[PDB]
Ligand binder design. Sequence first.
Ligand SMILES: [Cl-]
Lengths: 313, 64
Amino acid sequence: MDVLSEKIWDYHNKVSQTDEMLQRKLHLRDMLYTAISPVFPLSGLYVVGSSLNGFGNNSSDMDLCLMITNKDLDQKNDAVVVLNLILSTLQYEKFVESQKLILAKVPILRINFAAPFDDITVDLNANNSVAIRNTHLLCYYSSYDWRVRPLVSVVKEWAKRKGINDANKSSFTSYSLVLMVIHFLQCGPTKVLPNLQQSYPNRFSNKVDVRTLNVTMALESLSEKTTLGELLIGFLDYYANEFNYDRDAIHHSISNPHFWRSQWRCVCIEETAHSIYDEMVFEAIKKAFREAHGELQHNHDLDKLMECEPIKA
Amino acid sequence: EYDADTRLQMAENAASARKLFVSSALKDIIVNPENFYHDFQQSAQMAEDANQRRQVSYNTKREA
Ligand SMILES: [Cl-]
């Protein structure tokens, strides 16, 4: 391996989700299911998001989806009743320390814990099955090629340090970065990933019963063997261009309502107001994508890239 | 399990406390629950599955 690809892979192995963390999270899920299942028998409690989509970077967050029906569950009323009922139940579990019912388009129960799980925050939704389908889809993108995962790890870490992935709501989410990488590996100069939704429509659709999803089932250009470092360099170059972003809703103002939270959401299975501030932040992000490209192309030094100055917004 | 009788009452309590209602669909989920248990995402299987991948992809060399 060349030096840059080697440093990327090493970085990947050091920041990616550890066995210990994953085990703690799964244990916490099982503990929660034991307490919840008396109230919703035969229900399922599925891990979703970065904890199990193949792109985990050992974040203390964990998202859960409680499946109770095959139909869509009304989120305005029924999901809230369900989540409120769970809140009442978990009040008597001592491993649960605090809870919060967060009202949104998809209402969320946010749970915090005592014991040795107090570092972990759980977000629980009621039967938002698209989160499971997309966790399942990303997991197969994460194992389609050996380069996808280390290429997501460094980008996540870079974007985090560069301030492109930020706490302040005018920035990309971790999930947006993953979709951006996949979109790049699909539509970029080097075709690394196909469109799994189009190649296997019966497996990766939204009509798909989540009960039939099983990630342990590995199912079946390629002149392509460009390096890991070259993929990272190309990625940074790709999003140096405004026309490569998901700007428009269905001057190119940021018309897309899902711009920050679900950039290039069309990669996944389909599930208000921006200001001039969002646009300014977007402009800054492009510049960061241009700086980091010039930097890495010139040096091929991931360390120098990683001690970047955060962006100002 | 709590019986269907108990769970329906618990849900009605949960609803009225937030000025909500137990819909016909939710009552149906309670009376006749669909089996959505995570058979294919059990912790032991998931933990081993993910450990197989880390272990394979580092201490197997690829020549290309
Ligand atoms: Cl993610």
